[PDB]
UniProtKB/Swiss-Prot annotation:
Pfam families: Bet_v_1. One of its GO terms (biological process) is defense response. Belongs to the BetVI family. The gene is PRUA1. This is Major allergen Pru av 1. One of its GO terms (cellular component) is cytoplasm. Transmembrane segments: none annotated. GO terms for molecular function: abscisic acid binding; protein phosphatase inhibitor activity; signaling receptor activity. Keywords: Allergen, Pathogenesis-related protein, Plant defense. Gene3D superfamilies: 3.30.530.20. CDD domains: Bet_v1-like. It comes from the Eukaryota.
């Protein structure tokens, strides 16, 4: 009933910089890298820790676009981050609880490795469509290169 998808890649930028950005600055990282993807981020509950509910908005699509992310846990010592999504026009009535996980590390070449993972919790005996989960893989990969490029080109972004 639960789907499991993961992605593995690396970046020439340090993970402690992309980490402070994606997590300690997610509300200011996405709205600073490319405003063409999200309109703005506003935390609804908590302050960025576990149990905090963030509301990311989208500036693409005639209809209003936005989602809600519930922090699940992070590893400021290992640079890992994981949250739970409960809203999103992509979840439709076929999906309900969403689980998102992300991990950061370093490589022997100086660059940094980035391991991500996500899951789906359908409700009512339903399943997701490859076109849906497969599209998230390409969207999550492009976002990873936007965070590393942001700090790589913006040495002032929480760096």
């Amino acid at each position: 009933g639960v789907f499991t998808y993961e992605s593995e890649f690396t970046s020439e930028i340090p993970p402690p910089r992309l980490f402070k950005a994606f997590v300690l600055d997610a509300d200011n990282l996405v709205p600073k890298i490319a405003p063409q993807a999200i309109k703005h981020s506003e935390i609804l509950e908590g302050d960025g820790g576990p149990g905090t509910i963030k509301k990311i908005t989208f500036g693409e699509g005639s209809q209003y676009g936005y989602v809600k992310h519930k922090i699940d846990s992070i590893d400021k010592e290992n640079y890992s981050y994981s949250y739970t999504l409960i809203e999103g026009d992509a979840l439709g009535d076929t999906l309900e609880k969403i689980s998102y996980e992300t991990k950061l590390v370093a490589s022997p070449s100086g660059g940094s490795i980035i391991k991500s993972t996500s899951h789906y919790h359908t409700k009512g005996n339903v399943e997701i469509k490859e076109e849906h989960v497969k599209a998230g893989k390409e969207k999550a990969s492009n976002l990873f290169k936007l965070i590393e490029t942001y700090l790589k080109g913006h040495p002032d972004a929480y760096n």
